[PDB]
Amino acid sequence: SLDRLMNPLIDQYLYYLVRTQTTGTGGTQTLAFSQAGPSSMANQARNWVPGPCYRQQRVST
Amino acid sequence: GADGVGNSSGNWHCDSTWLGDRVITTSTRTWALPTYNNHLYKQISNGTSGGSTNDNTYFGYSTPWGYFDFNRFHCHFSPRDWQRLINNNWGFRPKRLNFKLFNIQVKEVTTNEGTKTIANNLTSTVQVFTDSEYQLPYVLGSAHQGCLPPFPADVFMVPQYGYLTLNNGSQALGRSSFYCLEYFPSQMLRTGNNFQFSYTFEDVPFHSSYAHSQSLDRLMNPLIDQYLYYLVRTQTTGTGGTQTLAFSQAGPSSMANQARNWVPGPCYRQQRVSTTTNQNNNSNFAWTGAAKFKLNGRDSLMNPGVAMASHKDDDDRFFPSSGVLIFGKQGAGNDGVDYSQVLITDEEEIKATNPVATEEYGAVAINNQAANTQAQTGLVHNQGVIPGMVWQNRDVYLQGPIWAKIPHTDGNFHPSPLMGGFGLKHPPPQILIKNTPVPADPPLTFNQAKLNSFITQYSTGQVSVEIEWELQKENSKRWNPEIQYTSNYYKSTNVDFAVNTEGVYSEPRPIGTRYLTRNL
Amino acid sequence: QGPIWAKIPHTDGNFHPSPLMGGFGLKHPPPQILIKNTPVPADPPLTFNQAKLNSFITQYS
Numbered sequence: 219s220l221d222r223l224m225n226p227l228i229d230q231y232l233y234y235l236v237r238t239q240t241t242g243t244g245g246t247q248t249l250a251f252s253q254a255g256p257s258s259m260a261n262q263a264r265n266w267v268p269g270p271c272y273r274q275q276r277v278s279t
Numbered sequence: 280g281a282d283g284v285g286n287s288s289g290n291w292h293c294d295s296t297w298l299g300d301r302v303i304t305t306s307t308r309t310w311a312l313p314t315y316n317n318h319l320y321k322q323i324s325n326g327t328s329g330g331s332t333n334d335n336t337y338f339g340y341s342t343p344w345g346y347f348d349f350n351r352f353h354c355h356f357s358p359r360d361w362q363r364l365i366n367n368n369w370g371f372r373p374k375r376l377n378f379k380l381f382n383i384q385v386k387e388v389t390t391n392e393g394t395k396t397i398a399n400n401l402t403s404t405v406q407v408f409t410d411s412e413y414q415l416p417y418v419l420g421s422a423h424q425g426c427l428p429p430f431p432a433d434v435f436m437v438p439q440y441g442y443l444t445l446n447n448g449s450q451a452l453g454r455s456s457f458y459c460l461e462y463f464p465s466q467m468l469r470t471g472n473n474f475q476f477s478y479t480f481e482d483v484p485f486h487s488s489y490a491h492s493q494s495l496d497r498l499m500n501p502l503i504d505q506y507l508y509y510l511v512r513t514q515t516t517g518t519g520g521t522q523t524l525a526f527s528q529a530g531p532s533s534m535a536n537q538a539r540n541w542v543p544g545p546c547y548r549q550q551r552v553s554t555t556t557n558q559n560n561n562s563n564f565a566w567t568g569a570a571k572f573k574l575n576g577r578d579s580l581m582n583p584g585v586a587m588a589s590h591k592d593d594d595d596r597f598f599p600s601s602g603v604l605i606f607g608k609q610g611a612g613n614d615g616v617d618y619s620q621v622l623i624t625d626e627e628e629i630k631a632t633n634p635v636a637t638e639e640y641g642a643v644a645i646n647n648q649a650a651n652t653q654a655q656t657g658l659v660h661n662q663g664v665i666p667g668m669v670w671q672n673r674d675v676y677l678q679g680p681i682w683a684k685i686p687h688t689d690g691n692f693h694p695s696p697l698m699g700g701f702g703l704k705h706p707p708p709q710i711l712i713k714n715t716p717v718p719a720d721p722p723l724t725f726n727q728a729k730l731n732s733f734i735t736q737y738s739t740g741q742v743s744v745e746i747e748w749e750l751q752k753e754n755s756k757r758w759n760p761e762i763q764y765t766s767n768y769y770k771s772t773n774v775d776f777a778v779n780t781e782g783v784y785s786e787p788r789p790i791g792t793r794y795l796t797r798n799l
Numbered sequence: 800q801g802p803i804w805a806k807i808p809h810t811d812g813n814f815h816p817s818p819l820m821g822g823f824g825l826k827h828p829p830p831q832i833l834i835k836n837t838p839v840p841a842d843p844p845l846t847f848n849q850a851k852l853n854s855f856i857t858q859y860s
């Protein structure tokens with residue numbers, strides 16, 4: 219798949235914004251960054267993105 | 280002798296040479312290869328079931344092979360060299376390279392009663408081969424760790440090779456393909472044995488090291504007035520309020536009105552976030568807020584997105600949540616690190632031709648104006664390419680990526696890696712290495728089983744990558760001094776891009792490529 | 800048991816550049832000869848680590 223173009227074992231040398239707010243009760247804004255890993259595949263940066271689309275109404279057999 | 284154990288099977292070349300356009304980089308590092316997966320190909324999948332979401336599902340395999348990656352600029356460039364290149368050229372691109380593996384040594388480690396000893400197995404071998412035909416899933420260009428170290432002195436571990444195949448949940452499909460590296464003609468080595476090859480970069484466009492010194496909108500002479508008119512008023516000024524058509528020639532004062540031949544580049548809206556904590560809304564919108572693209576029923580984050588200006592002037596604190604590259608400060612933690620550790624890159628240089636990441640592209644009319652109905656307009660958050668657009672590609676950094684393999688697809692548009700770099704159809708082939716399994720003594724009576732006992736060993740050696748880059752000198756007639764990357768004079772306790780008191784080279788900030796300015 | 804030569808500092812100017820400790824003042828003296836034992840890593844951990852190896856076999860030449 220276009221999304222799954224990277225090695226599972228390795229972790230990207232780049233970070234992404236993982237949280238805007240502290241976990242738990244405090245609820246105070248903070249900036250947390252994590253290196254996209256194998257487990258967090260969706261987060262990690264990619265060089266290519268999917269093709270174009272025009273919405274098509276769905277219908278079931 | 281030609282190839283013997285008491286003989287250097289190669290030398291150390293770590294030099295940079297500048298002649299004319301051509302700048303040649305040469306690096307050598309000392310690597311170590313662990314045994315991977317106990318000499319076993321393992322099926323690896325992450326399921327829908329359990330804590331993990333559906334968007335993080337995958338199916339693939341982890342191989343007993345390691346791979347050599349040099350796809351990061353800092354590997355071939357000294358910080359000082361990066362400076363010379365950035366500060367005096369309007370562009371550059373890779374032309375050819377040369378790879379070498381040598382002084383291979385294989386060690387066998389023994390442990391008895393808490394006593395550990397490491398000595399040499401000379402008869403032992405190490406397999407190497409290049410995916411010169413591109414038949415193996417392309418790992419590189421995914422920004423994966425494990426590239427040669429930035430500092431020459433450091434000794435590094437070789438990354439483990441593994442790949443992904445089509446999956447539904449934790450299951451594979453009929454289509455999904457399983458590759459066996461061993462089914463590849465690979466060359467074997469014993470110490471005093473060396474491997475090496477050469478590759479030449481397909482022709483690719485020079486990267487832009489120049490930042491525009493004219494906005495796309497401001498492309499016209501102030502003094503003169505356009506011979507064309509625009510609709511300036513729909514209604515008479517003052518009390519009367521009766522519809523009329525008034526036309527004016529766009530002049531110097533009315534710059535915004537005047538017609539233009541070119542329009543800004545494409546944009547995908549990126550949620551804005553402020554470095555200052557207080558300004559941001561008090562919600563965890565890291566994921567919910569962020570723009571994303573849905574493929575095959577799974578939503579993946581739009582990182583790092585299309586190339587767009589990080590911020591409009593004086594909005595320096597602002598950045599796209601996912602729309603810029605981020606580099607950790609040295610020693611930074613992998614998970615949930617504080618803001619201070621990270622180095623957030625800034626792509627404001629390209630603001631002149633590219634849309635701001637956090638703002639709309641502009642506006643379009645939503646309905647026909649009517650005698651009764653009022654005119655309306657809607658914002659454009661998502662804007663695709665149209666005739667007349669011009670734009671700048673995303674920048675590369677001293678510690679950025681270099682190239683990426685263009686997907687073998689029926690079609691694509693402006694295939695320049697979104698993380699920055701050169702898009703190649705046939706990039707530098709993946710180099711695969713592996714320690715040949717050396718079986719532990721077999722049982723005396725034949726067994727149909729496959730041997731599961733092996734001597735424990737790892738290998739080490741030097742590696743050499745030499746790349747020839749073609750420069751493109753500056754031609755500017757700019758009268759005033761241009762901006763340039765410099766190291767501040769003012770004293771400090773540590774030197775920039777040096778080792779600290781402990782022996783830990785560190786890259787204090789990301790270093791862009793565009794300092795020199797060129798006209799539009 | 801004295802010194803023999805010394806490298807004349809690369810400066811815009813100087814006077815009678817004979818090493819003050821005695822000897823021959825050379826602009827291009829015998830080049831410094833540098834030697835080093837190549838690091839030989841101790842067995843690496845089985846699962847890839849982004850860290851730089853800190854364990855080496857102890858040896859001298």
Ligand SMILES: Nc1ncnc2c1ncn2[C@H]1C[C@H](O)[C@@H](COP(=O)(O)O)O1
Nearest residue numbers: 483484692693694695696700701702703
């Ligand atoms: N870095 C990189 N790699 C590969 N292909 C690229 C790159 N940058 C632009 N392109 C595309 C853009 C055009 O489709 C073509 C060159 O045409 P031109 O008229 O020269 O832009 O190649």
Ligand SMILES: Nc1ncnc2c1ncn2[C@H]1C[C@H](O)[C@@H](COP(=O)(O)O)O1
Nearest residue numbers: 807814815816817818822823824825826
């Ligand atoms: N040992 C040594 N090394 C380098 N330069 C030296 C040395 N002794 C004298 N000099 C200087 C003195 C003069 O400037 C020049 C030779 O000129 P002359 O007229 O022959 O004295 O060299």
Ligand SMILES: [Cl-]
Nearest residue numbers: 607609610611
């Ligand atoms: Cl790091």
Ligand code: NA
Nearest residue numbers: 316321323341
């Ligand atoms: Na595994």
